[PDB]
Amino acid sequence: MKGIILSGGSGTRLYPLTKVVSKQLLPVYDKPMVYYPLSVLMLAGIKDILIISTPEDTPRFEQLLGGGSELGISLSYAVQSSPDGLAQAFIIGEEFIGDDNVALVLGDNIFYGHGFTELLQRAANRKSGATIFGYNVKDPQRFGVVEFDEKGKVISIEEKPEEPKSSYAVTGLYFYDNRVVDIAKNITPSARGELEITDVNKAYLELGELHVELLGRGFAWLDTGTHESLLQASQFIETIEKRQSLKVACLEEIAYRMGYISREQLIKLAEPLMKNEYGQYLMNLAHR
Template structure:
C-alpha cells in the first residue's frame, strides 16, 4: 500500500503568511503541520509516499528531503496548477500503479492518526473508503449523504443546500478502481477535477464505497483560527520539559517546554507553552496555548494563545493574543504622536466624532 500526499495549493486563507511559505509547513507546536501527517502515514505501516507539489516544491523538498527522517521513501510528483484532488490522482497514476493507496491532504490534522482506518481498509478492501465528520456549516466542504443503513448514496462538493452535516475529511483510501473514475469525470464549474465526482462515479457504477464517521478531532488548518485551535490541542498533549535556562527571577507553571538553548529571564510562563531553541523571553509574560519558534526575542511584552514563527521579535508592545506572527517579523510600539482625525468628506456630509 502506498500514500499520496497533497502538498500543493496556494493557501490563500493563510495569507500573508503563505505569500512566502508553504501552508503545509506552517508550524503547530513548533512542528510543520505536514510532518504530523507524514508521521501518521509511517505509523500505519506505509513507507512509499508520492508527494504532489506545486509552486512551493523547493521549500517542501528542502523540509521533507527523501523522507528518511520519517521512515518513508518520498517520490515528488509536480503539479503545474492546482486543478483538483482528482487531478492529483490522475497525474500520480504511473507512480501508484495498481497498488491500493491512502490520499492525505497535507494541511489536515487528525488526532490519533490513521492506523485504525488503514487496518480496516486492508481487511475489507472496498473500492473506496472515506472519512466523514459532522460540521456546523457543511457548505464549505464536500458533503456525503447516507441512507438509513449508513451506505454512501451521494456526494456533493461545497453544496449551497447540503443534504447532511457530514463533511469529507481530507483522508481517502482507494483501490486502483479510482483511476478509471478520475478519467471518466469532467471539470466542475470551478475548473477542477473533483474527487467527490470521481467517488460519485464509483457509486453510480455500483462499486463498493464505504464511509467511517470519525469521533475524534479533525481540522483543516487552512485559516488562522483553525491553526490556533490545532496548536492549542497539540500543546495540551505535551509534557513539561525544561532543557533551556530559566533564571531565579522567572516562573514556569504547568506544561512548559523550554528547548535547549532557549532562555527565560525575569519572566512568567504559564503552560501549555513551547519555547523554541535559541529564543529569549525577557521581562515578559507568555500565556497558555502559545508556541514560540526558534531564535525569537520576546521582551517587555505579553503573548497568549498565539503562534510566533522563527527569527521574530516582540518588544515592548503590551499584550498580544490570538495572533499568528510570521518569520523575521519585528513588532514594536508605535511612536507617540498627537491624537488627530484625518478626513476627506464629500458635500453635505454628516460626521460624528467621539472626543
C-alpha cells in the first residue's frame, strides 16, 4: 500500500494566514498541520508516500518534511496545477501508484482515538476493494454522506445531499485497490467543476466492495477549516498531550514504534534537538 496526502488548495477562508502559504503548513498546537495526516499513513503501515500541493507550496512541504529517510520511509512530491478535485490525486499520482494499492488522506484532516491504528492497519492490509471512514457530524449536508444498514453495510453515498440519509459524514481518509486509477480517469467533473471522491466511492459501491469503518463518538475528527476551528483543534491537542506527557503525531516516535527506525536511530534524531522539549520527548521515548 502506498499513500498520498492531498495538501493543496488556496485556503481562502483562513486569509491572511494563507496569504502566502498553504493551510497545511500552519500549526496545530505544537506541530505543523500536515504532521497529523502523515502520522496516520505511517501508523497504517504505509511507507511510500506522495505529497501533492500547489506550485508555490510543494517545495515548502519538501523543505519541512524532506525525503523521509530519517523516519525510515520515502516521501515524494508532486504539484497540482489547480485544485480540480480530490480524485485528481490519482491522476497526478498515476506514475507513483503504478500497479499498487493506495490510500489517500487530506492534508488538513486530524483523526484521533483509541483503537484507530488497528482500524488503519486493517484497511491498509486489504488486498481488494475500498475502505472509507464515517463519522457522526452536526451538519452532514456539508460533507460526503454515507448511509448504512443494521449490519453496517453501505447502501448509498452522496456528496453534500440537500436531504442527508444519515448523520455520518465520509471523512477525508480513503483506502483503495489499484482499480482507483482507472476509476478516477473515467469519472467526469461535477457541477462545481471537480473530480469528486464521492464518485470514486460510488464506483466501488457498484462493484460491491465499498467497506465503511464507522468511527464512534470516542474518536475525534477535527475541523481545521476556519480560524475558530483551527484554534479548537489546537486546544484539543494541547489538553490530550499535557495531561499524558505523550504526543499526538510525533513522526519520529511513530517511526520508532512501527519499527521503521531503530532505538539507536531515534537517539540520533533526539540528540541535535535536546535544547527543546520535542527533542527531550524523543529521548525520553528512547529510554522507555
